[PDB]
Structure 1
């Protein structure tokens, strides 16, 4: 791979982010992007600052410089698609920082594990092309073939891991190079396990194992740490409905357009298109958010907060509040 030039670093370093608390639950990434031309440098600056303000890279021998390289190597592998772009992963990073520090989930993890989560956020969707795992299987594309031949149906997640492990194999972007022995091994293994658990086909399985582990006082401790890491990245990944309504709406618009584009390409190839991806059906934003809330998000956040993440209660509160707000949009459309 190429190296990261010194001008690119200064482009990020210069951004001062006035009037923005990056650690706050109500931080608005959309506002931050509209605040300037070159939102890709403001995005990266947000990640930079989050990782410094945690105190964590310094403790694991990661320099202010290779941190910035790592971010920019990540950024360059994100494509210009409507949802699964660089801004999604910065959002997941920032959101995870709030669960750890405002939600007190840091209490349940080592410092290394907190550092790994913040890093993993930034790699967890590398080289996403706006198409889901199903698309690669039904069209027998090379990645689908390659994943089917090695056993794993998690087509993209294996791919994102391969690219994470590739970015980290260059020493000038290796944020885990300051680690040795069991610590170094654990950074890689936990990063990879977390990215693989982002496959929503495995959603129910991962939730149910975390909850079983949290109910049991005699659970293996290392295993409960690992499941909690996985649950927190999953939580970040489905965190759009836990934000102030206007932010939550903007995320829903971006996702919807990405799904519609997949559906148009499925039509071109004669492959089957589920109704969620079908632009012509022209379903309302609101009904789809309420369905996501009821089937996926509300149960997930309610169950993990009750089982053991008590500090994350606001997520359940804001899901409820956003749901009633979408109900009001239907009732008055």
Structure 2
């Protein structure tokens, strides 16, 4: 709705507004547009101002991060954009600037962007079972998450990419420790442990307690990481096919190499519907339910689409079941 046409990398006022909501269609944008979106988030959240981030360094850093994301069906730059856009949406929805310091917002945003850097498209179970260079390097302790972390700090060590160059050493150490904790917390093998620890703190939550806040930040990055089903159906649905494509690539390789195959990755056992019913019911809904205890606004905005999505996949399952009996 402007007097002239502006290039794609110059975000329209409408795009800037839409970016604050979890309804934002992540599929409409090319890498350069998503890069402009992330850059806007840093300026808009006051991170550029409060951490004296050089605006050109912010751009070079984001471009370098983008280049270090592999062209995987799911674990790609668009996924990191989803996680960072969901984190940004949660800052506004949950009024996180009232509860968190600017350093904490910086940690949450930087970890969301960096969390899946240089992902090979084969999970930790593959790395460990196949005894890969990564599993050997990390001694089977979250090999991928440790690698995403190392790559993040390797990018940040390059002077033209150092968005933390004007932050005192004590501030850097604080941000570094926080980012490591958050990226490592994304390992789904640790889900039950992190959920139990958070629920334990949820008995009498304290925003002044550093340990309570560390666990809340861990839950926040975890929420954003697996948040696809929270998005509108049309935006959410294509991500499942992307992930199954990655899961099938791994399970085929494991079968060929004689390694164990996870049933949720097996082409002969998995369907888009059955995989999502379980994940929404037993992972997504319980996690957002605990967040709702601190942030009641999460129920209407995030649990509601999850309830709808669960109900839609249950309808699709009945169709798949009717279809699969004719297959034999």
TM-score > 0.5 by shorter chain:
yes
Work out the CA distance in 1 between the residues paired with 2:32 and 2:122: 26
* Per-residue CA distance 1:135-163 (angstroms, 9 max, x = gap): 01111111111211xxx521101111111
Per mean C-alpha deviation after superposition, the further-off stretch among 242-251 and 206-215 is 206-215
Q: Is residue 2:213 matched to residue 1:214? A: no
2:94 pairs, out of 97, 100, 103, with: 103
- What is the aligned residue count? 310
Q: Is residue 2:219 matched to residue 1:231? A: yes
Work out the CA distance in 2 between the residues paired with 1:74 and 1:183: 22
Change (3 A) 1:175 1:214: farther
DSSP 3-state at the match of 2:254: helix
1:323 matched residue in structure 2: 310
Deviation (angstroms), 1:14: 5.7
Q: Is residue 2:271 matched to residue 1:284? A: yes
Work out the CA distance in 2 between the residues paired with 1:243 and 1:86: 18
DSSP 3-state at the match of 2:116: coil
Q: Is residue 2:25 matched to residue 1:28? A: yes
Change (3 A) 1:105 1:321: farther
1:41 matched residue in structure 2: 32
1:78 matched residue in structure 2: 69
Change (3 A) 1:232 1:218: closer
Indicate the RMSD between aligned Cα atoms, in angstroms: 1.8
Work out the CA distance in 1 between the residues paired with 2:304 and 2:55: 37
Per mean C-alpha deviation after superposition, the further-off stretch among 319-328 and 126-135 is 319-328
Q: Is residue 2:165 matched to residue 1:177? A: yes
In structure 2, list runs of 5 or more residues that go unmatched. 1-6, 321-328
Work out the CA distance in 2 between the residues paired with 1:23 and 1:219: 24
2:113 matched residue in structure 1: 122
Deviation (angstroms), 1:215: 2.3
DSSP 3-state at the match of 1:80: coil
* Per-residue CA distance 1:233-283 (angstroms, 9 max, x = gap): 11100101111111111111111111111111112212121222222x163
Contact 2:205 2:212 in 1 (8 A): no
Task: Please report the TM-score for the alignment, with normalisation by the length of structure 2.
Answer: 0.89
Change (3 A) 1:325 1:99: same
Work out the CA distance in 2 between the residues paired with 1:270 and 1:283: 20
Per mean C-alpha deviation after superposition, the further-off stretch among 17-26 and 253-262 is 17-26
Deviation (angstroms), 1:222: 1.5
Contact 2:114 2:152 in 1 (8 A): yes
In structure 1, list runs of 5 or more residues that go unmatched. 1-12, 33-38
Work out the CA distance in 2 between the residues paired with 1:204 and 1:15: 41
DSSP 3-state at the match of 2:215: helix
1:16 matched residue in structure 2: 10
